Amino acid sequence: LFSVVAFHCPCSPARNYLYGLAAIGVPALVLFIIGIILNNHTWNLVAECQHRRTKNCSAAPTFLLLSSILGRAAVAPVTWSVISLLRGEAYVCALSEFVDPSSLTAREEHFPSAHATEILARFPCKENPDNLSDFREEVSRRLRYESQLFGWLLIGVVAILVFLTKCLKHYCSPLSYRQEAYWAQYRANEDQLFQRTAEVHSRVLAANNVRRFFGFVALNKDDEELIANFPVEGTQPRPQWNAITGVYLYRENQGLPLYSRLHKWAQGLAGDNVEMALLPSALEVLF
Amino acid sequence: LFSVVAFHCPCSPARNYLYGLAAIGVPALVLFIIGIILNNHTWNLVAECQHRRTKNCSAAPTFLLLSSILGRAAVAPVTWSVISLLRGEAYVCALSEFVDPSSLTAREEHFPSAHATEILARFPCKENPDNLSDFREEVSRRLRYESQLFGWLLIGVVAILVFLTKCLKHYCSPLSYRQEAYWAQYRANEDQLFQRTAEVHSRVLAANNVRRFFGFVALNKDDEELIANFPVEGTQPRPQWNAITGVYLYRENQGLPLYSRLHKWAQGLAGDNVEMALLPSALEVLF
Amino acid sequence: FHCPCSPARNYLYGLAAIGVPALVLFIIGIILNNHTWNLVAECQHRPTFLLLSSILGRAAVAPVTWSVISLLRGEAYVCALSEFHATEILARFPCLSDFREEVSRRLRYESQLFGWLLIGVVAILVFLTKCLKHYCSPLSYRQEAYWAQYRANEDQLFQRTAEVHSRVLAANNVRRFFGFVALNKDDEELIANFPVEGTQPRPQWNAITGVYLYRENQGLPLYSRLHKWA
Amino acid sequence: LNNIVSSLQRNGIFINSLIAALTIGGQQLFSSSTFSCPCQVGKNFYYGSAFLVIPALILLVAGFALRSQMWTITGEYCPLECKLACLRFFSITGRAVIAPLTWLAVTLLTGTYYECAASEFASVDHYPMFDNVSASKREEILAGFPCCRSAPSDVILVRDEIALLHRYQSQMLGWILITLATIAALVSCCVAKCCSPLTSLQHCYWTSHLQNERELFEQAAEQHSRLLMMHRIKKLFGFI
Amino acid sequence: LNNIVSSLQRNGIFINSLIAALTIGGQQLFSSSTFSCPCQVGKNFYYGSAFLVIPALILLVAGFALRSQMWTITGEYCPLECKLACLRFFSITGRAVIAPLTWLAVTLLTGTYYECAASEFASVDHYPMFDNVSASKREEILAGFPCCRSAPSDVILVRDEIALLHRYQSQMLGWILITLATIAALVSCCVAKCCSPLTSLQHCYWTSHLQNERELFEQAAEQHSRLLMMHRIKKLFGFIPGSEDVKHIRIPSCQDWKDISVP
Amino acid sequence: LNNIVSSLQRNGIFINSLIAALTIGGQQLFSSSTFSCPCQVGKNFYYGSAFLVIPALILLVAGFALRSQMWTITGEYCPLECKLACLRFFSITGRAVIAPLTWLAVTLLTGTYYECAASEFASVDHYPMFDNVSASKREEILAGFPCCRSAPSDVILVRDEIALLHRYQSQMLGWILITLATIAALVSCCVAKCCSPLTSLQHCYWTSHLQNERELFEQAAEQHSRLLMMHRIKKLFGFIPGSEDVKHIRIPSCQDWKDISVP
Ligand SMILES: CCCCCCCCCCCC(=O)OC[C@H](COP(=O)(O)OCC[N+](C)(C)C)OC(=O)CCCCCCCCCCC
Ligand SMILES: CCCCCCCCCCCC(=O)OC[C@H](COP(=O)(O)OCC[N+](C)(C)C)OC(=O)CCCCCCCCCCC
Numbered sequence A, B: 001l002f003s004v005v006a007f008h009c010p011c012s013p014a015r016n017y018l019y020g021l022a023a024i025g026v027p028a029l030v031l032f033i034i035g036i037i038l039n040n041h042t043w044n045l046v047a048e049c050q051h052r053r054t055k056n057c058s059a060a061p062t063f064l065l066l067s068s069i070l071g072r073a074a075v076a077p078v079t080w081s082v083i084s085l086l087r088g089e090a091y092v093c094a095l096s097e098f099v100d101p102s103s104l105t106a107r108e109e110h111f112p113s114a115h116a117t118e119i120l121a122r123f124p125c126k127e128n129p130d131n132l133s134d135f136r137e138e139v140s141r142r143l144r145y146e147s148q149l150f151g152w153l154l155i156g157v158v159a160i161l162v163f164l165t166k167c168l169k170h171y172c173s174p175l176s177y178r179q180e181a182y183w184a185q186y187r188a189n190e191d192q193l194f195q196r197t198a199e200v201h202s203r204v205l206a207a208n209n210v211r212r213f214f215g216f217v218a219l220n221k222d223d224e225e226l227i228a229n230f231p232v233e234g235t236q237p238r239p240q241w242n243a244i245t246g247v248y249l250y251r252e253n254q255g256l257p258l259y260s261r262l263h264k265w266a267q268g269l270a271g272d273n274v275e276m277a278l279l280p281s282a283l284e285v286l287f
Numbered sequence C: 001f002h003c004p005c006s007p008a009r010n011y012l013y014g015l016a017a018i019g020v021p022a023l024v025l026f027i028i029g030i031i032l033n034n035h036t037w038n039l040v041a042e043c044q045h046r047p048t049f050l051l052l053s054s055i056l057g058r059a060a061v062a063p064v065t066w067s068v069i070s071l072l073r074g075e076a077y078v079c080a081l082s083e084f085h086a087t088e089i090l091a092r093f094p095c096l097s098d099f100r101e102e103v104s105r106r107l108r109y110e111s112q113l114f115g116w117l118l119i120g121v122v123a124i125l126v127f128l129t130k131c132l133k134h135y136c137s138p139l140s141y142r143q144e145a146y147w148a149q150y151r152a153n154e155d156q157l158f159q160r161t162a163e164v165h166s167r168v169l170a171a172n173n174v175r176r177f178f179g180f181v182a183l184n185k186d187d188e189e190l191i192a193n194f195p196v197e198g199t200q201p202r203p204q205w206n207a208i209t210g211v212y213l214y215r216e217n218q219g220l221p222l223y224s225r226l227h228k229w230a
Numbered sequence D: 001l002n003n004i005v006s007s008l009q010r011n012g013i014f015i016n017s018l019i020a021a022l023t024i025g026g027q028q029l030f031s032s033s034t035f036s037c038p039c040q041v042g043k044n045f046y047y048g049s050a051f052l053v054i055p056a057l058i059l060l061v062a063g064f065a066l067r068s069q070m071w072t073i074t075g076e077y078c079p080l081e082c083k084l085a086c087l088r089f090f091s092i093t094g095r096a097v098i099a100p101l102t103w104l105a106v107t108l109l110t111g112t113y114y115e116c117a118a119s120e121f122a123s124v125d126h127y128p129m130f131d132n133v134s135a136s137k138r139e140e141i142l143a144g145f146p147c148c149r150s151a152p153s154d155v156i157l158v159r160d161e162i163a164l165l166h167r168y169q170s171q172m173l174g175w176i177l178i179t180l181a182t183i184a185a186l187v188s189c190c191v192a193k194c195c196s197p198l199t200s201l202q203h204c205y206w207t208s209h210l211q212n213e214r215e216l217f218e219q220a221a222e223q224h225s226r227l228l229m230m231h232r233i234k235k236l237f238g239f240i
Numbered sequence E, F: 001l002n003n004i005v006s007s008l009q010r011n012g013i014f015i016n017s018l019i020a021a022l023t024i025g026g027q028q029l030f031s032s033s034t035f036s037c038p039c040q041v042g043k044n045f046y047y048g049s050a051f052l053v054i055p056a057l058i059l060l061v062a063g064f065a066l067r068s069q070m071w072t073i074t075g076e077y078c079p080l081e082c083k084l085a086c087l088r089f090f091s092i093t094g095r096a097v098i099a100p101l102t103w104l105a106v107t108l109l110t111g112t113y114y115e116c117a118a119s120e121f122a123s124v125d126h127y128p129m130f131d132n133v134s135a136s137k138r139e140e141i142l143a144g145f146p147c148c149r150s151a152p153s154d155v156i157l158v159r160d161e162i163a164l165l166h167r168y169q170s171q172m173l174g175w176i177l178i179t180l181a182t183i184a185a186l187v188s189c190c191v192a193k194c195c196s197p198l199t200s201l202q203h204c205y206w207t208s209h210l211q212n213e214r215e216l217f218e219q220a221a222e223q224h225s226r227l228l229m230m231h232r233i234k235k236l237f238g239f240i241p242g243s244e245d246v247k248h249i250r251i252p253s254c255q256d257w258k259d260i261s262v263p
Helices: A016-038 A040-051 A059-073 A075-087 A089-094 A116-121 A130-172 A177-214 A221-229 A238-242 A261-266 B016-038 B041-052 B059-073 B075-087 B089-094 B116-121 B130-172 B177-214 B221-229 B238-242 B261-266 C010-032 C035-045 C049-058 C061-073 C075-083 C086-091 C097-136 C141-178 C185-193 C202-208 C225-229 D002-009 D012-031 D045-065 D069-077 D080-096 D098-110 D137-142 D156-194 D202-236 E002-010 E012-033 E045-065 E068-077 E080-091 E093-110 E112-117 E137-144 E156-192 E202-237 F002-010 F012-033 F045-065 F069-077 F080-110 F112-117 F137-144 F156-192 F200-236 F254-259
Strands: none
Touching: A016 A059, A016 A075, A016 A089, A040 A059, A059 A075, A075 A089, A075 A130, A089 A130, A130 B016, A130 B041, A177 A221, A177 A261, A177 B041, A177 B177, A177 B238, A261 B177, B016 B059, B016 B075, B016 B089, B041 B059, B059 B075, B075 B089, B075 B130, B089 B130, B130 C010, B130 C035, B177 B221, B177 C035, B177 C141, B177 C202, B261 C141, C010 C049, C010 C061, C010 C075, C035 C049, C049 C097, C061 C075, C061 C097, C075 C086, C075 C097, C086 C097, C097 D045, C097 D069, C141 C185, C141 D202, C202 C225, D002 D012, D012 D080, D012 D098, D045 D080, D045 D098, D069 D080, D080 D098, D080 D156, D098 D156, D156 E045, D156 E068, D202 E202, E002 E012, E012 E093, E045 E093, E045 E112, E068 E080, E080 E093, E080 E156, E080 E202, E093 E112, E093 E156, E112 E156, E156 F045, E202 F200, F002 F012, F012 F080, F045 F080, F045 F112, F069 F080, F080 F112, F080 F156, F112 F156
């Protein structure tokens, strides 16, 4: 529920800004992590640093993609820190103990100087003396001003940055803006179909193994059509799979574009030692 | 939801007017940015300077199009800032500290001269002296008058501007409004077919590449029709894509009008060195 | 609504509150029509007061009613007269009981005395002006009815004319790029139904656009510039 | 049910009945909206005279302007043909002037419009208190009391009898005007049944032919244009 | 259900009941809205007399004039023919007069019109307190007490009594009128059953013939007019209205438009 | 469901019940609204007598009059035919007289009309308090107390007694009337089962035949009128009304309109 994740300000000195940092930074940290995990463009980058094992690719291609990973990942932390600031509860809690008594106004000098830190820190929790009520409301509007000002400024910077990157991304892109639209349409169609056939190819392969065990497979109406229409003969080799996973930056062959590593592999432009073998070489098997 | 997106005046001198600027100007600014991004005319304008890299186009062709895009996307800021001025909260909050107590009338001069700015600042937040409630009501109806007076004028100004461009467009344009209506139909409807074919071409291209991987493609009921009806062989080169990207201004050939760059390229009026190749020259490949 | 009772400044608020919104609405109506832009085509290309006043009054209906509904409330006029040191107190009535109420009766009397003057002008305009124009014109209402319906039906057919022909031309351009068109089932027979032979040059479009006033020859009536084009 | 409504619409009795109802409804709202019985000492009869006559005659102009039969009458007028125009004018007239008499009757039976109009014309000879030999304050207070001035000065007895005498005279006028209008409607109806060359059944036939003739020609005129555009488009781009 | 409603409409009884109910509602609304019962010392009997009689006359004239049968009878007037015309005029007389009679009966039952109309004609010789030897204050107080002048000065009880008397008298008058009306109706029917040349079967047949003939004549006239104009337009524009004109088009000249301008 | 309702309307019991209910409701509303029990000392019996008797006669005359067969019966009156006419009049008498007796019974059982009617006819010899040697104030107070003048001056008990007495008498009359009517009804129906020549089953069939021939004759007369009128149109304009008249158009001359002016 919301009450479980609700904000409860600890009206204590040198304590509330720790909580405000944790109650806001951690939910921003998690949403930043989730953006990285769900994005596919980071795993092929990880796969890139895995298979090469030599740092063959330079830093320039990596930097332009790491920005793409972090650029899309950072939407959720930003739109979460935006709303938290616009609420103002987190900021007034955190900076209540740093309000200057000298800067306090709208009231005569009735603000006690005995425990300035202690008295100020309890303002958010309405635990304020009646002689200090105007002082409490003065802080309640002063700190909320800085909270919302930073809230609109952070939207302003982000909205400018989104405009700034996209303007420069098109300008520095060797391709036109309409071929990238076609390229974006192909990559969506390649991934949609590839995941569709992967489910079907696995199911037909799994059904062939289950048939070998029991002698028959209990298949519904739709699963019957898959076996008849789409028959498989064997599994794809590991190097074939490794030749389509990774990072690809618009390589072109004979004046004709290639849009993905799967497209590049299908043109034959991608492809002694035995690895992770179940059993040793046939010469060793004999003995 | 609506509570977060609201105005909350911080009653403080030299601090209330900054909030009015940010809480109103930034929402206007972001809404301005959204319109610029979504409009396609800016990207082909960017693509114009992208491909030439030589400043072939003069200032006059860019002068109209640069203003054309900004004005068409400025609809969101005006329809927002009008509402803020109609409410009047931003203007009364921003100009509260600039109200001259001398100009206040309809009452005996009960306003103290000790801190005139401080007292006037706290009027919007209901922190107003009862003996100055009329002064609050005087200022409340004074600045709110100015908020709407600029608000109504701004609605008038845009209406005059919208008249001025549309009236001046027909007179200065070399084409009749009826023909331009036909031309506007072409551009707004050719792109509907061009984007529809790109999805089908990509889907066929994606299907022709997944088949090379697994040996079969799992296609939906509609998708088999696309493969049978539109079987593709290869792709279109990058220069062929560059010939249909950019700004077009009613170029005519032999008395037959051309309506778009794609039409211009179709007639053949738009179209050795190897760039961004996957692999080097075939002479180097042999070694 | 908001009624700023400040002295020496309410009259500016009153004028802006009834005048600016009225003219803006007169604007939106005249964008919405297409007949006004027809005269723009003729004047740029090259006895025309009859049409100019006709189109202007067609879109002037809604700005007037907002002006009339403004004076139905009557608060706009009472502020201007009351404003015109007790003068501020007169302006501060809406926001000495006998003197303040003495003028207030005159304010509402003056405010209502102007509202029906406009309604008289509209009543005179809609009645008197409409008969004098139609009586003087030699064309009968049956001729006029065929005139308005000729233009009204031709644009609807022309837009249907333009839409189908444009889809034939555009699909030819797309096929030049990819090699096929992702046309739908309805669009499937569209290209085969109408094989276009050529496009219409600029003078052909320019010849049919403009204002036309029965430039008849050979006894066959002509109603629009497109009629004389053929 | 819709067919029944259309048949009722074909009957002018419902049109007149509905028009009177909206005029009464609009009048009752408007009398309490911005009338106020304005208290002008100098010239207050103008306000009452304006509200008594002008709103009524405005709907007369509205009735004439909203009907196209008068347009054909004036075009021909600017014998049997002239005589038929008079009958056509007579039929349009009945629906044209029905609304103002409803407005005139309702306002005058209300009484408030004429009390605030002819108050300055009241006579003070019956009242020994309103001597006022100066001849200045008498007219000031005379235009003052009926508007909003209760004036608790033992003169209120004057204003009720003035109001009651005004109210009574107001009722007699409308009922006489309504009776006069009814007699005028009767005799004009009698003139239209005597001078008309048509019979009691032939006139209905002629009117039926007129109403049937406008619609048939108008729909055929619409078809004639549409059909011509269809060839024009065929000659224009080559499709139908 | 709609057919049942139409059958009830054919019967006159529901129609007269609806007319009476509408008159009752109108009387109640008018009495609630605009009576005000003025005291006008001089002219007060005339106010109530007008409010009692004039609405009855307007209802009578509206009822009689709204029926086209009365117009046809007057046009024929302007033997057997005289008798049939008289019977036809008398047939709708009851529906014509049912509204003003209901108006009058309701007003007399209410008694407020009779109270504000016949107050100045009250008797004062019985009351010694109403001597008023001046012969002037008597009439002003007589006209002024019924309206709003309560004046609880040992006079109200007296005035109350007079009101009661008038109310009582008012009721009687109304009752009497109703009785007479009923009798008149009966004798009228007797004339309708004594001076009528038609037998017990010919009257309904004649009325049905008139109604049916008027309806079929108007429908046939409308059809013939429409048919004549389809032919006129067929001559005019070269094609039949309501048909397909892919065959011939006249393309008329300017002089042709004036030809159809005769009617 | 509608057929069942149409079956029930054929039954006279449901109709008599609906009429009784409407009369009871109307009596209740009239008594609660426009009675007011006037305290006219001089003439107070007239008001109660009118309110008690006159509406009964009005309802009775209405019950006779709105029945169409009454005029036919009177015309025949104006052997076996006489017996049939008398039996038809007796049959309609039940519906004519069901309503006024319901009115009288309800009014008498309620008692207020009788209390306000015969108050001044009461006797004061029982009560020594109403001495009144003057012979004037006694009738004043006697006609004054019943309506609204309670006057709690140790006389109300007597007034109360008087009211009760009158109410009691009123009640008796009502019941007596009921009883009398009932006996009359019985013997009346007995006469219809003795003087009539037809049998028990022959009468019901005969009435059904009468209703059927009347309705069918009216419909046939209307249809014959329609056939005649339409024949007149096909003769005049040359086409059948409501048919495809695209064949010929007469275009009659001016004189032809006078031809159809005969009826
Ligand atoms: C709930 C919705 C609310 C509306 C606001 C969110 C809109 C979401 C859609 C636009 C975002 C987007 O997609 O941004 C895209 C770009 C990425 O550019 P790139 O690295 O070149 O990737 C190339 C583009 N790709 C990914 C399509 C291939 O982002 C940025 O550069 C910045 C993102 C803004 C947040 C982080 C700003 C910097 C940190 C903060 C500094 C104070
Ligand atoms: C959310 C919708 C609500 C409805 C109300 C708005 C209607 C929108 C559609 C009609 C208006 C429109 O789009 O105007 C369009 C024109 C653009 O003219 P251009 O620059 O030559 O562009 C060429 C026209 N093209 C793009 C079609 C080729 O605008 C203008 O001239 C200016 C915009 C007016 C607002 C900003 C004023 C200037 C900034 C502020 C200065 C004080």
